[PDB]
Design a protein around this ligand. Structure first.
Ligand SMILES: *[C@@H]1O[C@H](CO[C@@H]2O[C@@H](C)[C@@H](O)[C@@H](O)[C@@H]2O)[C@@H](O)[C@H](O)[C@H]1NC(C)=O
Ligand SMILES: *[C@@H]1O[C@H](CO[C@@H]2O[C@@H](C)[C@@H](O)[C@@H](O)[C@@H]2O)[C@@H](O)[C@H](O)[C@H]1NC(C)=O
Ligand SMILES: *[C@@H]1O[C@H](CO[C@@H]2O[C@@H](C)[C@@H](O)[C@@H](O)[C@@H]2O)[C@@H](O)[C@H](O)[C@H]1NC(C)=O
Ligand SMILES: CC(=O)N[C@@H]1[C@@H](O)[C@H](O)[C@@H](CO)O[C@H]1O
Ligand SMILES: CC(=O)N[C@@H]1[C@@H](O)[C@H](O)[C@@H](CO)O[C@H]1O
Ligand SMILES: CC(=O)N[C@@H]1[C@@H](O)[C@H](O)[C@@H](CO)O[C@H]1O
Ligand SMILES: CC(=O)N[C@@H]1[C@@H](O)[C@H](O)[C@@H](CO)O[C@H]1O
Ligand SMILES: CC(=O)N[C@@H]1[C@@H](O)[C@H](O)[C@@H](CO)O[C@H]1O
Ligand SMILES: CC(=O)N[C@@H]1[C@@H](O)[C@H](O)[C@@H](CO)O[C@H]1O
Ligand SMILES: CC(=O)N[C@@H]1[C@@H](O)[C@H](O)[C@@H](CO)O[C@H]1O
Ligand SMILES: CC(=O)N[C@@H]1[C@@H](O)[C@H](O)[C@@H](CO)O[C@H]1O
Ligand SMILES: CC(=O)N[C@@H]1[C@@H](O)[C@H](O)[C@@H](CO)O[C@H]1O
Ligand SMILES: CC(=O)N[C@@H]1[C@@H](O)[C@H](O)[C@@H](CO)O[C@H]1O
Ligand SMILES: CC(=O)N[C@@H]1[C@@H](O)[C@H](O)[C@@H](CO)O[C@H]1O
Ligand SMILES: CC(=O)N[C@@H]1[C@@H](O)[C@H](O)[C@@H](CO)O[C@H]1O
Ligand SMILES: CC(=O)N[C@@H]1[C@@H](O)[C@H](O)[C@@H](CO)O[C@H]1O
Ligand SMILES: CC(=O)N[C@@H]1[C@@H](O)[C@H](O)[C@@H](CO)O[C@H]1O
Ligand SMILES: CC(=O)N[C@@H]1[C@@H](O)[C@H](O)[C@@H](CO)O[C@H]1O
Ligand SMILES: CC(=O)N[C@@H]1[C@@H](O)[C@H](O)[C@@H](CO)O[C@H]1O
Ligand SMILES: CC(=O)N[C@@H]1[C@@H](O)[C@H](O)[C@@H](CO)O[C@H]1O
Ligand SMILES: CC(=O)N[C@@H]1[C@@H](O)[C@H](O)[C@@H](CO)O[C@H]1O
Ligand SMILES: CC(=O)N[C@@H]1[C@@H](O)[C@H](O)[C@@H](CO)O[C@H]1O
Ligand SMILES: CC(=O)N[C@@H]1[C@@H](O)[C@H](O)[C@@H](CO)O[C@H]1O
Ligand SMILES: CC(=O)N[C@@H]1[C@@H](O)[C@H](O)[C@@H](CO)O[C@H]1O
Ligand SMILES: C[C@@H]1O[C@@H](O)[C@@H](O)[C@H](O)[C@@H]1O
Ligand SMILES: C[C@@H]1O[C@@H](O)[C@@H](O)[C@H](O)[C@@H]1O
Ligand SMILES: C[C@@H]1O[C@@H](O)[C@@H](O)[C@H](O)[C@@H]1O
Ligand SMILES: C[C@@H]1O[C@@H](O)[C@@H](O)[C@H](O)[C@@H]1O
Ligand SMILES: C[C@@H]1O[C@@H](O)[C@@H](O)[C@H](O)[C@@H]1O
Ligand SMILES: C[C@@H]1O[C@@H](O)[C@@H](O)[C@H](O)[C@@H]1O
Ligand SMILES: [Cl-]
Ligand SMILES: [Cl-]
Ligand SMILES: [Cl-]
Ligand code: NA
Ligand code: NA
Ligand code: NA
Lengths: 525, 525, 525
């Protein structure tokens, strides 16, 4: 058996067989009072207490959230949908600990992405039992509130202050500071890692003075708060909150009255309306996300970043080669997972309209300009629109974050993931898609039984070791198997490392031309 | 009289006449519960307590261990055999303190070598009364468990977790932190020094976070954990533990059952079997040694070293000119202490087979290649095989440890001991053998009565002062008698200092060609 | 009235009129138990306690000590003799505090010189009322034991451990740490300053870990522990202690018996014998001085200095142009204060014999060599012998101390005092004598009534300000009156500053040729 005495009381885990060995899992440990009723929209409140043993033996409810129904039956999209019941009663977390119980293990705290609107920690690709087996770290993950239930903002108003999902994340990190030593974990050795919105959330914990002391280091996969989807401004947030009240017929004179009304609405009505709180929204729309609440976040993050006002520590940051493709089949004309999507100039022009709703005419023409001069290919426009979307949304904000961060003294490591999963269910033209490094990081290809190639095992093995070396030692080398040394990202040289199954290479200045466009010029339009 | 009140209770020492003066010795102070019975194989447990006075007036039991019987009657080998009764009841330590009682003396803590299989602190060449007389430091030494009784590993299993000898060492350092101030010693000024396995153990205390706070600085004579004999991997350890169970007919389904059985076996049966737990073993075999227990040692030490995860402090590291010769007369064909051992190519080839059991055919041919191109000498092959064995085993791992360590900021000093003791009982062709600087460090030649030359007195005097200056001031200069300044070992210049009776010289890049072979190339084969 | 409540109880001071203003003096505050009887030769014991008010209204007893009787009636020498009753009951100190009572004044603690054999703090040239009036610092001075009563050594023997005068000094600094805040003084802003043996004592407080925390910064006028008169080695000390026992017929089997006997002898018999405990002694002889006691001082100070083992802080160090002249009229042939002492080669040769008793023949010839090649002057040999004595004894050890100290990172300032007091009672050929900057430092020429020139007032004014700026701010600039900036003494450039009534100049490499002789070469002979 395996009871562990936490501050809140005792909890039971379950033994897992992994790679001829054992991991102990604690699935579904509550970390907050369920945010129901009076508590919906509020910050997570400290969890009651309890005698008797809590069975943390299965994954807990996933938070309310709209589901991706664009490809029913399709593993590509469906692997991302919640795989446990939705419920507002969702403030739970998971612990994988090596067997035997470690003495002082480094801890990795995963924060899932999904645009701040969706996601859950119980996804198969977020399963921590491998990292715990293989690198002997303890892996933790938590569910946090998404969509309006997690980010509805009416700032300076504790009824719905904004940022509740982040404070959920924070409360979980805290639970780790208070309880992980009982699990053989070292609260002084915690690395947050996360992907996409998850990566952005991690970068926001680097800015939140509330988070400073609740972790050691950070990893950002395909996301950073300076991405253009990451932060709703106070204006658009308030607009959106009201727009929502309107659609639920919860418009009121008084603002606490609006909240009180929104709290009698049922999750579904809120979920159903979340979509049209925005004018023209895109496949990247973040209807309810992080804002400048003057609590988690004290100023526009761009200012804090520019001015070195953040946790001084090492970071590991990275993006995938074809970041933007996943999004083009959610609205872009003549794109389809089911053919090769050779599109015309005219179609390219219309897709911009889709990704840059407004965004002026000249703005769009300037994107078309920067992106349509070439060594002349039917796939030209198709390739270009994916690259427009990844660069603007993922790659360039990540390279600029690394740059800005690194300028203040800390070591930074940058990777460019370029391996297309041999099992990817999406078609070929989509390439190395957004989110498809995660399974490498979590070490699924280490599982011989699971239809990955040998080369894939090897590559995941190495990534898994670099991630682990990073968390434990702030240095993501793989020192034993005669590997390519990963250099720090300097402003000036901007070296980054390439991850693939063949030649792993040191390279400089990723997307140089592209990012000058997006980073210098584009904000001005 | 001379009682000193320790935490555990009072203890009595004895006055020694030394060099027209007095040293106070405390020999055989218990520091742990005797590791007998239920406790065999476990970590050392905190020592009972006691009223009445413990007489620490003679050296205590030496730990169980196999004896070197290759030259009965021969002082060369026999000087190393235990010179007190063997017993599992062996967790004792010794204190030499200057008279009069010092006010705040720096402390040197000796850790003996002997391959982790043998050794004891009561050897005549480890006698601390000279250092205490001459440099007025307090010298401490402890016995720690060797062989399986000290290193039997079944990891994650407190019944035999591995590394018990190291935790013995650690517990002794602790006793020093808790008690040495009562002896006029400064717990804030402790230098660990040790030789061979002892040197490796010291280097492992540099990695063990458990040891960080229990000492100031370190000296490594002819040994470092990155030597190829120093660390048993988890695999080979477990293999060896089982192999042992098998030979004692202690194979069991359950693993605690295996330990329980091994604990009813008598030390001798365990001692007798320890040898053939290994396939083809060599004269350098370490059947039961340090492992990655995830307690004393959290990861492969090569990684921690490579990644700067160690105590930041000064080190003094060194090797002897003819490190490998001692081993060739324990199995190498046509070697003998009793003639000059001119050997043939064919004999050289066979000796490699002896030192590199397997180790591929090409591996051995590459050693023969690197080592058999010369200015053409009958002693060629004889000289070459000694040099193969010292370089691989002692010199190159020590130079690489210094290099790696020094890269993180700390001052490092490197010496190359090249004086052949005028009393060495081994023959001439063996040169400046492994272990034969110890008597210089401990200052035996300072003893006029003892058949050393004047030049030898002088050289020991100087070494003794440099060691002392190192421990007290982290700088191993001899500042008064117009000496050669010892420079720090930098990566890039790699200056080291030569110790002999004539010209003491500054030199660069010891065994440059040789170590590139062993350090870069050889691990790959 | 003016009572101040110290830890020991209340004390009364007296108002002084100074420069149209008021200083409050506390003269003769006890700081230790009187070291009489059982206590003679022991370390100073913590002072009883007391109700009622101690009148600290006049200078207290000066410590036992032989008097200079070479010029009865002569102000030159007699200004140095004790000007209060001698008594073993002499452990007293003085405080000058500005009126009105300061809020948080920097404190200067004067330690007098006199070869460790003589001196007292109540000398007119040590009067702190001016510094207190003019720079508003609090000035403290203490009497400490001199001669054998203060330095008799029998090391490791608390009956007479050596160094009692230093521990007297230390105990006084302590009294200042514990009590000066009650006097409006800042215990965190204490600068020790002292001259000659006093300067050496200051430099020894830089080495004594016991002193680390009892002061901020240091000033060394004409003295440093590395001067050849400053430290008696353990041998010569013990020799001297026994030699003394012999002359008092206190030779005994047992060593505590020797002390017990020496304690029934009356101060005079001890005082009378102190002189011939030495073979051939010189005018610079220090019969009983600092030793390596393994308490105040843990190792030969040369080693600690060479190895950076000292308090890291700023120092201000300096010497006078004609350091050695004062000594030549105490034994050197054909020298006299009463004529111009043109001496012959032969006389020069004999004076060396006087200053370098033995000291080999070649040693003396090498001094004559280095010092007798010139632009050919009858005063040649007379000038040369003064310069031999000052360089060896004062200048070169001070320049080398500054050099060595400064190499470890701290700012150092060096001055060369070159003004001959217009009132000096010694004759002209003696030039700028040893000890005759003190009156400048203490600011006597600020006193208009006192027969100094205007230029002298100005120069003292400036010195007094630089000293004050040094203590308060660690930087001895005089920033207001368009002065020459005092540069830090670097190893390499060795800039020092010249103090005189006309051109104050920056200069490099004082006595370059001379010190290489004394510093490199001479120790070898
Ligand atoms: C690619 O497919 C696009 C998507 O349209 C829908 O899916 C395809 C596969 C058909 O089943 C069609 O009935 C649906 O409208 C087409 O718009 C696009 O033109 C096709 N492009 C090609 C074949 O290159
Ligand atoms: C050196 O001796 C080797 C060791 O063999 C043994 O010891 C010698 C001294 C003899 O007593 C012999 O009976 C033993 O077998 C010999 O193998 C080797 O050939 C000898 N080499 C020489 C003389 O150069
Ligand atoms: C300088 O005086 C030296 C000291 O000797 C004594 O003092 C002098 C002034 C006389 O009063 C004499 O009776 C004493 O012996 C003489 O040794 C030295 O030769 C004199 N040198 C001169 C005049 O240049
Ligand atoms: C369901 C519940 O609340 N607690 C259960 C306990 O009753 C049960 O016996 C055990 C199974 O091993 O798992 C836990
Ligand atoms: C092993 C354990 O129980 N606690 C330790 C703690 O003492 C130490 O300060 C820290 C280093 O980061 O690792 C954890
Ligand atoms: C921001 C702007 O230009 N216009 C807004 C619009 O977005 C919104 O739908 C409406 C109701 O809130 O108020 C107005
Ligand atoms: C500006 C305004 O109308 N404020 C009111 C306030 O009186 C009250 O505290 C709150 C309670 O829900 O309702 C609203
Ligand atoms: C209710 C309201 O104010 N709606 C406006 C509407 O006129 C317009 O269609 C929309 C698009 O910008 O912005 C908003
Ligand atoms: C839903 C959608 O994408 N429809 C378009 C349609 O306009 C076009 O006819 C077709 C090519 O045949 O590509 C697709
Ligand atoms: C970190 C890493 O990639 N480690 C490797 C593993 O894949 C491989 O089996 C072997 C060397 O070939 O041991 C180790
Ligand atoms: C043997 C023992 O346990 N204690 C002895 C004590 O009896 C004895 O008198 C002393 C000799 O000086 O040494 C200790
Ligand atoms: C002499 C003694 O009793 N204790 C001292 C301690 O106060 C000091 O901090 C230390 C310096 O390393 O040396 C020891
Ligand atoms: C490691 C290897 O290749 N083979 C091992 C061998 O060493 C061992 O003797 C046997 C019993 O443990 O199991 C197998
Ligand atoms: C895996 C296994 O068989 N474990 C057992 C366990 O029930 C027990 O705690 C131990 C006591 O010695 O013996 C063994
Ligand atoms: C009991 C057992 O498995 N023994 C094997 C054996 O076949 C072989 O002689 C040895 C040498 O590699 O390795 C092991
Ligand atoms: C035990 C041993 O070393 N035996 C060898 C033997 O093969 C050889 O005959 C001899 C030279 O005569 O050298 C030796
Ligand atoms: C540290 C060292 O080697 N010290 C020497 C000693 O050997 C010698 O007797 C003398 C100088 O010649 O004093 C000192
Ligand atoms: C002499 C003595 O012990 N204490 C005296 C006190 O009696 C006296 O009245 C005062 C003069 O103002 O000075 C103090
Ligand atoms: C003025 C006073 O009463 N005390 C101060 C103290 O608070 C301060 O830390 C120090 C600075 O060196 O100066 C003194
Ligand atoms: C040091 C030396 O060479 N000889 C000494 C001498 O100084 C001294 O007068 C005598 C009595 O102590 O003992 C002898
Ligand atoms: C070595 C020697 O003779 N020591 C004695 C010692 O017994 C005693 O403690 C001391 C008391 O003054 O007198 C002396
Ligand atoms: C009592 C004694 O031993 N005296 C000697 C003596 O022979 C000599 O005059 C003196 C000078 O070196 O040194 C001492
Ligand atoms: C005590 C003294 O110094 N005496 C000398 C004396 O030898 C010499 O005659 C004189 C010059 O006349 O100088 C003086
Ligand atoms: C520090 C220093 O030398 N200060 C001077 C003082 O001598 C002079 O009277 C006046 C400027 O001429 O004010 C100030
Ligand atoms: C301060 C802590 O030290 C220990 C390490 O295991 C942690 O990573 C952390 O750096
Ligand atoms: C409630 C708001 O109504 C208006 C529209 O322009 C917006 O899209 C939003 O739906
Ligand atoms: C911090 C301590 O300071 C004192 C020294 O004697 C010790 O070596 C140690 O460095
Ligand atoms: C117990 C094991 O048996 C098999 C042999 O290959 C090994 O040497 C070992 O002795
Ligand atoms: C630390 C203290 O700070 C204040 C100053 O007045 C003192 O000189 C001292 O430096
Ligand atoms: C006591 C000693 O006696 C002998 C002399 O050589 C010394 O000068 C000393 O006086
Ligand atoms: Cl690689
Ligand atoms: Cl030398
Ligand atoms: Cl000036
Ligand atoms: Na542009
Ligand atoms: Na090679
Ligand atoms: Na010379």
């Amino acid at each position: 058996d395996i009871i562990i005495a936490t501050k809140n009381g005792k909890v039971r885990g379950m033994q897992l067989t992994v790679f001829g060995g054992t991991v102990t899992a604690f699935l579904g440990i509550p970390y907050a009072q369920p945010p129901l009723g009076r508590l919906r929209f509020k910050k997570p409140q400290s969890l009651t207490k309890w005698s008797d043993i809590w069975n943390a033996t299965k994954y807990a409810n996933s938070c309310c959230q709209n589901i991706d129904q664009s490809f029913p039956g399709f593993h590509g999209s469906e692997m991302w949908n919640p795989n446990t019941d939705l419920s507002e009663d969702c403030l739970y977390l998971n612990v994988w600990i090596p067997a035997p119980k470690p003495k002082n293990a480094t801890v990795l705290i995963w924060i899932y992405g999904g645009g701040f609107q969706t996601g859950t920690s119980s996804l198969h690709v977020y399963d921590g039992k491998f990292l715990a087996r293989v690198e002997r770290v303890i892996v933790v993950s938590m569910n946090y509130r998404v969509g309006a239930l997690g980010f509805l903002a009416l700032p300076g108003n504790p009824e719905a202050p904004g940022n509740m999902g982040l404070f959920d994340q924070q409360l979980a990190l805290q639970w780790v500071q208070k309880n992980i030593a009982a699990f053989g974990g070292n609260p002084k050795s915690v690395t947050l890692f996360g992907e996409s919105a998850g990566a952005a959330s991690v970068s926001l914990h680097l800015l939140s003075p509330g988070s400073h002391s609740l972790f050691t280091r950070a990893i950002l996969q395909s996301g950073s708060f300076n991405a253009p989807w990451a932060v709703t401004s106070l204006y658009e947030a308030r607009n959106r909150t009201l727009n929502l009240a309107k659609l639920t017929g919860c418009s009121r004179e008084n603002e606490t009255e609006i909240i009180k009304c929104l709290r009698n609405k049922d999750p579904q009505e809120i979920l159903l309306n979340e979509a049209f709180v925005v004018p023209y929204g895109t496949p990247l729309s973040v209807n309810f996300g992080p804002t400048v609440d003057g609590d988690f976040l004290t100023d526009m993050p761009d200012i804090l970043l520019e001015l070195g006002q953040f946790k001084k520590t090492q970071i590991l940051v990275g993006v995938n080669k074809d970041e933007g493709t996943a999004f083009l089949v959610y609205g872009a004309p003549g794109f389809s997972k089911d053919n090769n999507s050779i599109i015309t100039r005219k179609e390219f022009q219309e897709g911009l309209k889709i990704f840059f709703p407004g965004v002026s005419e000249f703005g769009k023409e300037s994107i078309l300009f920067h992106y349509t001069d070439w060594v002349d290919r039917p796939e030209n426009y198709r390739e270009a629109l994916g690259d427009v979307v990844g660069d603007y949304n993922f790659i360039c904000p990540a390279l600029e974050f690394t740059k800005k961060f690194s300028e203040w003294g800390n070591n930074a490591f940058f990777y460019y993931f370029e391996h297309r999963s041999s099992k990817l269910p999406w078609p070929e033209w989509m390439g190395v898609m957004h989110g498809y490094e995660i399974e490498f990081v979590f070490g699924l290809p280490l599982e011989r039984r699971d239809q990955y190639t040998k080369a894939e095992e090897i590559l995941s093995r190495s990534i898994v070791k670099r991630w682990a070396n990073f968390a434990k030692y702030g240095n993501p080398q793989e020192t034993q198997n005669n590997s390519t040394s990963w250099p720090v990202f300097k402003s000036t040289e901007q070296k980054y490392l390439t991850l693939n199954t063949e030649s792993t290479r040191i390279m400089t200045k990723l997307r140089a031309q592209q990012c000058r466009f997006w980073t210098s010029f584009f904000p001005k339009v």
